């Protein structure tokens, strides 16, 4: 399972209410059921260079809630 | 895109801090990359009868965050 994600050079950096550091990066999402891409932000560890990628994702369950886990280690530049 | 979800008769009902009502139902998730199923809860509108289903999901973006949207209207009993 993978999806095309067009990243940008827009990265929101800052500290959370808990004093913890976070790095949110912007990126556009492409859905087979959507004609236009959606602007989304990702909680990346390292800044990703702007460009379209085919990221292999999986459905992980955290604290009992189903969430998406994107594998940036196996993403393919589109 | 679909995934096997084994629902149960465990539904957590209650009010949120905002006084709003919520209906959380239990269900087991099946991942191709996992040998055993994971216990997960869903924010359903109506109680679903315990049983394994093949639910067609999609990746929706809310408030700029990528999340899963399960289509219980097109799920197939497994």
d(CA B50, CA A36): 37
What is A1-78's CATH topology?
A: OB fold (Dihydrolipoamide Acetyltransferase, E2P) (2.40.50)
**Is any Cβ of chain B less than 8 angstroms from the Cβ of A40?**
yes
Which residues, 6+ apart, have CB-to-CB distance to A18 below 8 Å?
Answer: none
Cα separation, A42 vs A61, in Å, equals: 17
Residues of chain B contacting A61 with CB distance shorter than 8 Å: 29, 38-40
Distances (CA, A) of A20 to A14, A16, A23, A38, B46: 8, 5, 10, 28, 38
CA dihedral B9, B56, B74, B69 (to 10 degrees): 70
The structure's method of determination equals NMR
């Amino acid at each position: 399972m993978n999806i095309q994600i067009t990243f940008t050079d827009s990265v929101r950096q800052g500290t959370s209410a808990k004093g913890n550091p976070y790095t949110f990066q912007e990126g556009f999402l492409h859905l087979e059921d959507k004609p236009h891409p959606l602007q989304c932000q990702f909680f990346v560890e390292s800044v990703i260079p702007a460009g379209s990628y085919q990221v292999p994702y999986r459905i992980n369950v955290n604290n009992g809630r189903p969430e998406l886990a994107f594998d940036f280690k196996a993403m393919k530049r589109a």
